[PDB]
Amino acid sequence: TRDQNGTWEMESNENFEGYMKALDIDFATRKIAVRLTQTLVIDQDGDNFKVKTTSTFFNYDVDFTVGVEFDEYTKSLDNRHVKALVTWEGDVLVCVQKGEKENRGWKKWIEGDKLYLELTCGDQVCRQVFKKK
């Protein structure tokens, strides 16, 4: 399925530390963020996505249209400018964030009743699994 709608609660988070370190997120921030349960709220209508990520101490919200390039300032993360593009490869939603960091982006897909999110930066891969609320 390409339907990623829903409220998704984090089951697992592997190598979030390595991903954040590759983004040059400060030590203090990383130490808090790695411990936190994330909730991902995805509102998907056709090509239009509105995504909200919440935890006790940090938020990150992004809206995008599949197949439409969009400039991003990664406020609250690493504060960089990237040129972002989100497209489908089969039922995998693929984001490339073109800019200073190499191999920066993410891939997201549904398998069973779970959402998988693979965050990449440089030589680091973070793997997250969410289950539907």
Side-chain angles (χ1 to χ4, degrees):
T1 185
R2 288 183 172 153
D3 186 10
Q4 300 181 350
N5 270 291
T7 298
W8 298 92
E9 194 190 353
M10 171 173 274
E11 277 198 353
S12 58
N13 194 6
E14 173 185 341
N15 194 35
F16 192 34
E17 171 83 88
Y19 169 80
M20 286 187 287
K21 186 179 295 186
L23 285 174
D24 314 312
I25 297 178
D26 66 86
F27 172 89
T29 299
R30 296 202 313 265
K31 291 323 271 283
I32 297 304
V34 67
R35 309 163 177 171
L36 297 185
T37 308
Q38 300 192 25
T39 297
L40 186 63
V41 180
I42 300 170
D43 180 359
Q44 172 186 353
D45 180 30
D47 289 339
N48 303 294
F49 281 78
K50 289 75 51 197
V51 184
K52 293 165 76 177
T53 309
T54 60
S55 67
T56 305
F57 298 107
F58 306 112
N59 296 333
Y60 186 83
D61 302 347
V62 67
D63 304 335
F64 57 85
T65 298
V66 173
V68 174
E69 190 159 80
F70 62 109
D71 290 356
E72 282 197 288
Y73 175 63
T74 55
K75 11 141 182 176
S76 67
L77 252 60
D78 62 316
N79 300 292
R80 290 190 173 96
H81 293 277
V82 297
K83 187 175 67 60
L85 178 64
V86 185
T87 57
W88 292 107
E89 292 184 3
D91 286 11
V92 181
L93 191 66
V94 177
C95 175
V96 179
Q97 296 161 315
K98 290 295 191 171
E100 183 58 41
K101 299 286 170 181
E102 305 260 331
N103 303 284
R104 184 184 183 154
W106 52 253
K107 298 182 184 184
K108 186 189 306 144
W109 66 96
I110 305 301
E111 283 174 325
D113 299 325
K114 293 179 176 175
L115 183 149
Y116 294 75
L117 176 56
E118 193 161 286
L119 298 152
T120 61
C121 184
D123 64 352
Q124 296 298 307
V125 181
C126 165
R127 302 165 214 276
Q128 309 180 338
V129 186
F130 296 82
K131 58 173 176 185
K132 219 178 198 188
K133 248 308 152 303

